């Protein structure tokens, strides 16, 4: 970066970034910590069913609570992009990681 190492980008609850996310030998996310999952859950809850963004390694995931009516503590994971090159190149791991994140959020 063209800025001092004593300065970092200001964060937002709209965009959560998890730096040291463990990777599995099959090129997938491992189990996130309980504190990480609770932070994602609480942030999605505070946004009342509207999507928040979650950065795991170098990919972006969209997460919302209110996945189903009746239970607000149900979480949905999706992803979206415009650049065809990144989708063409990463869609398989992106989808698999999205499944895993959803599974961890609801277990």
Author numbering: 9 to 115
Please share excerpts from the published article on this structure.
Here, we show that the Salmonella Typhi STY1076/t1865 protein, named StoD, a homologue of the enteropathogenic Escherichia coli/enterohemorrhagic E. coli/Citrobacter rodentium NleG, is a T3SS effector. The StoD C terminus (StoD-C) is a U-box E3 ubiquitin ligase, capable of autoubiquitination in the presence of multiple E2s. NleG effectors share a conserved C-terminal U-box E3 ubiquitin ligase domain that engages with host ubiquitination machinery and have highly variable N-terminal regions presumed to be involved in substrate recognition. We suggest that StoD recognizes and ubiquitinates pre-ubiquitinated targets, thus subverting intracellular signaling by functioning as an E4 enzyme.
Therefore, residues 1–101 of the domain were expressed with an N-terminal tag in E. coli, purified to homogeneity and crystallised as native and selenomethionine derivatives. The 2.5 Å resolution crystal structure of StoD-N was subsequently determined by anomalous dispersion. The last six amino acids of the domain are disordered and not included in the structure. StoD-N crystallised as a tetramer; however, inter-subunit contacts are predominantly formed by the N-terminal tag, suggesting this is not a physiologically relevant oligomer. Indeed, size exclusion chromatography with in-line multiangle light scattering (SEC-MALS) of untagged StoD, StoD-N, and StoD-C showed that both the full-length protein and individual domains are monomeric in solution up to 16 mg/ml. Despite two loop regions having higher B-factors, the four subunits of the crystallographic tetramer superimpose with an average root mean square deviation (RMSD) of 0.34 Å, indicating StoD-N has a relatively rigid structure. StoD-N has a globular α/β sandwich fold, comprising two α-helices packed against a twisted four-stranded β-sheet, with one parallel and two antiparallel β-strand interactions. Second, ubiquitin has structural homology with StoD-N, which is again made structurally distinct by the additional C-terminal helix. In both cases, these localize to a defined surface, which for StoD-N comprises the N-terminal parallel β-strands and first α-helix within the ubiquitin-like fold.
